[PDB]
Paper text:
Here, we develop monobodies to different STAT3 domains to interfere with critical cellular and pathophysiological processes. In contrast to the monobodies previously developed against several other SH2 domain-containing oncogenes, none of the tested STAT3 monobodies target the SH2 domain, but instead bind the CC domain and inhibit transcriptional activity of STAT3. The recombinant monobodies expressed in E. coli with high yield and solubility and size exclusion chromatography coupled to multi-angle light scattering (SEC-MALS) indicated the formation of a monodisperse 1:1 complex with STAT3-CF when the two components were mixed. We found a dominantly enthalpically driven binding (∆H = −22.5 ± 0.5 kcal/mol) with a binding stoichiometry of 1:1 and an ensuing high binding affinity (KD = 7.6 ± 4.5 nM). Two monobodies bind one STAT3 dimer, in line with the 1:1 binding stoichiometry determined by ITC. Inducible expression of MS3-6-VHL fusions in NPM-ALK expressing mouse thymoma cells resulted in the degradation of endogenous STAT3 protein. STAT3 degradation by MS3-6-VHL was impaired upon proteasome inhibition, indicating ubiquitin-dependent proteasomal degradation. We reasoned that different molecular mechanisms of STAT3 activation by the two cytokine receptors may account for the observed difference, as IL-22 stimulation was reported to utilize a non-canonical constitutive association of STAT3 with the IL-22 receptor in the absence of cytokines. This alternative STAT3 stimulation is mediated by the constitutive interaction between the CC of STAT3 and the 84 C-terminal amino acids of the IL-22R, which lack tyrosine residues.
Numbering used by the authors:
A (entry chain D), B (entry chain C): -1 to 93
C (entry chain A): 136 to 371, 382 to 398, 400 to 417, 428 to 689
D (entry chain B): 136 to 188, 191 to 371, 379 to 419, 429 to 688
Amino acid sequence: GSVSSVPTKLEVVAATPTSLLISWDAPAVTVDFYHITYGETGGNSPVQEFTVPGSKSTATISGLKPGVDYTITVYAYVSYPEYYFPSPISINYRT
Amino acid sequence: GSVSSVPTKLEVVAATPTSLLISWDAPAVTVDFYHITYGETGGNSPVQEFTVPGSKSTATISGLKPGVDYTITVYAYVSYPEYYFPSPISINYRT
Amino acid sequence: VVTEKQQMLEQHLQDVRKRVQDLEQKMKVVENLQDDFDFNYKTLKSQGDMQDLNGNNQSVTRQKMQQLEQMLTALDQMRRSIVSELAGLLSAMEYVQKTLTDEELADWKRRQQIACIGGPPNICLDRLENWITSLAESQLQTRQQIKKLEELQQKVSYKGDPIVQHRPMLEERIVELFRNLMKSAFVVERQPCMPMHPDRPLVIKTGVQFTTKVRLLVKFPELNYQLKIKVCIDKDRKFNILGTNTKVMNMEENNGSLSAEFKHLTLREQRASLIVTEELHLITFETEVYHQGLKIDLETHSLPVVVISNICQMPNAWASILWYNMLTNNPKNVNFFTKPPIGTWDQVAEVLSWQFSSTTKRGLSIEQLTTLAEKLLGPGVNYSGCQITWAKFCKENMAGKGFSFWVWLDNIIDLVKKYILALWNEGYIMGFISKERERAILSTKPPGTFLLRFSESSKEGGVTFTWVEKDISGKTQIQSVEPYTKQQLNNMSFAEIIMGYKIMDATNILVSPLVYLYPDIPKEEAFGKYCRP
Amino acid sequence: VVTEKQQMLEQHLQDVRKRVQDLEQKMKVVENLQDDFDFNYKTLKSQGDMQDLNNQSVTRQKMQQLEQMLTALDQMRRSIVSELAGLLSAMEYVQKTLTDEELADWKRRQQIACIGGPPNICLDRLENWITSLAESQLQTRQQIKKLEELQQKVSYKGDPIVQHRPMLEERIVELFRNLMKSAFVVERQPCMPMHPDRPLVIKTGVQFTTKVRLLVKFPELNYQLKIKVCIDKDRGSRKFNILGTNTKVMNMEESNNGSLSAEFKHLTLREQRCGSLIVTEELHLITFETEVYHQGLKIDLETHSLPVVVISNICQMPNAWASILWYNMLTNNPKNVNFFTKPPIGTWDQVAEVLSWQFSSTTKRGLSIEQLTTLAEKLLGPGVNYSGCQITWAKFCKENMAGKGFSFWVWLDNIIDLVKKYILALWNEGYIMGFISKERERAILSTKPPGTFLLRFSESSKEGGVTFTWVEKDISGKTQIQSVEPYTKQQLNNMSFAEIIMGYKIMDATNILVSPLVYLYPDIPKEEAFGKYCR
């Protein structure tokens, strides 16, 4: 009936060879804040992370090795009505 | 204002030489019932008694030695709003 | 004297207790855990919020919110366990409560019936109170933890909460349990009875003072002076109670148990289809208690009671009470006498012996009993199985005389209580005897010997004596004297009657009896104590 | 350890108890009597009514006999109501003797405990006295309600109840309400768990804990009271909020004697925004509120913490603790948030005991009289026997000292911090002389040989460090002293102070002499004293 993930959609919208900008359609739940993780696909290079406030619907990642496959994941944390912890959404981009 | 006797007034209204009839004020309190006592004033003969319901405002006494001084007393018992036991009223009649 | 059924109960109650003690500690743990979660989430949010003010987007690690998501999962797994252990407890407690209410308590409600009509009085509701209280404290503890879960849920919840889904039935269950256990613990301890006729409970004459007492077997001090009991009669021929009509349960007993005694009650008829000594009424006692937010209506009632205008009616009334309580155990059957059941002699015999053990040292023998069998049934021996109608026992007259069986006997007992009680005790009155055994018995012994028995000729009930003259054919004839009634015995004691008694056989006055009471006994020895001047 | 004052209280309480036991029994008789009256009147009335349908059923003797028993129970009602008011007075006295004396003594012994030394009596035996009186008051409440019952049933124009009961009720309610508000106490004062020695100082964003008790041990109340905690309820000053788990429900299985407690462990503070006193002098109250409904009585409760200092950063704690020391040493009012607008003055004789406490609270030995009199010189100026001298808040903290860059108190807090975390063993065994005039430092050591040395704290640094001092000797015969630049927290991470001492050497002619240290002060060879602590 409904798409279950944290944000329902996730895309990249502008991109330079060393940085991306991501947008997710604005959530119907009340998100306290999101985590954003990106890492080289298959690597044992550890994963990079930062937070964005629930306010926002986009962040920029930078410092990307240009042509490599990055796995980008967005997590959300909800407490407003009750605690939620929705399952996240990922995409793969190479720049 | 005031006057504490249970009936306020008491009089004899009709009389034959062997019997009397007594009337008192209808009482402002709610009388459960009255006692009526009559005895020969000096007489160390005992006192005679009977009851009338609170309903009534008169009783008849009979069997009186004609010319003798009888002391007549009326008592009332009140419980309606609360228990009372008002002081009684007596008169003296000789027939 | 403790049964096995009871020492097992005693164990179930201690098991229920420890079960709830364990849950109470399991919830300090599940409370700790959700506090830990909630605290950490908010601290890590005001921190991943406030330091975003100053530019910083790397304060709160994903590791620390995988660790938080995981401790939410843990406590849901614990909430899950707890709510099913709780329902597990509730089932244990529903079982223990049947075995209290439907067995051990119903056994007392009955032993009480038997006690009322003369039987061994088992009563002592003490050990029954301790079991009910032990289970009610357990249930209260349990109530507090099921409210505890409501508290936890407001604080911390989520889409699948085991509490949102299962608690509502956990509450429903523990409330029905507690409400029902309190309604069952509200019992009439001493059944209505006029103080002047102690042996005749459940018969109330109008305008006479009677008394009754209720107990509540949940010994919670929270409830002292908190419950006002309103007594009445015939709640929806018909009556009212007058006097002091509400009483407030205190614990100044006995064992500091929650009682409330009504003395100061009388009945008045108010302004009609079954005869009055068979028309039954209930005296009901109602109260309400508010306990830690729970309203709990209470209502118990007396055993059915016969209500009478005049004391001449009491033998028939008591008959009705005997017939009711001997035969049914339903406490509220007002219409019992529209189709009365039948009883076996083997039950009726034990009740009659009770009407004499209840009131005196002796009770009835098997010879005495078997001759009363003949009065109810007709001739025979070993009646064990024979059945007995209400009509044979009281409603219909007997053996072409003008009166009931029961009325005859009540009046005889009344006579043995108030006059001649000393002689009944100690067995100088052999009261119930066939004329043929009266003869066969005395034939054996010398011609002066004599015997004391009750009249069969009068409703009123009197006593007489019988001796044996012997005749020229060699046969033994009996003589009995016109029996001595309540009216004769005000002016002389029965024993004094016996010493002084003589008869005129030709000429002059000999002492007919004045020799021996049945078994070989000089007369002075047997009634010398009552001569006095 | 029981006072005589207390065993007398213990007696008053058994006396109030049997007084009320007697009244409850005196009211079973007064109840019996009015039942007897009422029953007989109605009996003799339905009879002197029903048979009128025969007017000689009810004798005047029997209505004189009734009138006279009404009089009897009014004479009894009269007696009861004054015995009752008699009881109420007895109970008001016992209650000021509990609230205003024995309880106020504990509320204070608690203040002292908070700033070091004499850890108080537990509340257990204070609880049993308060419950003993509350049960007595309850029993009394029930009998004053009993009289309301009797009145509805049987009354008359002069009723002693109608006239006097209303004040009896007023009295027993004020008594009970007040005894319960007084029994609602903070048992363990707010405190961050990782700075136990510093109660009543709360850093923002750190978890702290506090615990309340209710000293009326009535099981009726288990799981019935929800305590809401907050801060700055209801001034030209800063405001905060509590975050975390903010309500708790008092139970009885948490405490060993089964007492009614409620422990808050998940509390933190956050400052709130808006438009007097530096922050280490600005005081706040943490308040705890609940409501109880007991047998028809509502009873609002509210108690609060001792005043607490709230700080941004841990560098602020020595000033904060100074404020707590100054407050609790000097006043016993628990709610004076504006104490520091006109701080009072203290005598040295009381300041001395508090400083020795800052060292007994935290270690095996407090401060000596030599150690103490040399801290006197730091606060006042030169002299001997300071007993009366007075000490300002300004001299103690707030203003710097003896023309150095820092407060007295800050210097000492930092020294204590150093004694706690490094060097604690040597303090405990009394190998550190610590506080000593330079002149006694010299006079003391001159008697002794040229190796001998002593350990003392730096006076040069807020930071707080230790050093040692020894005696070279010169041709005139005089004794010279050397001290070394003191060893701070920053040096002692990498070597233990005892290791520093043994290994230490400085220069002779051209080669690093070997220790100038040889003996610890009173005739004691160096290895003998610091061998235990080296490698």
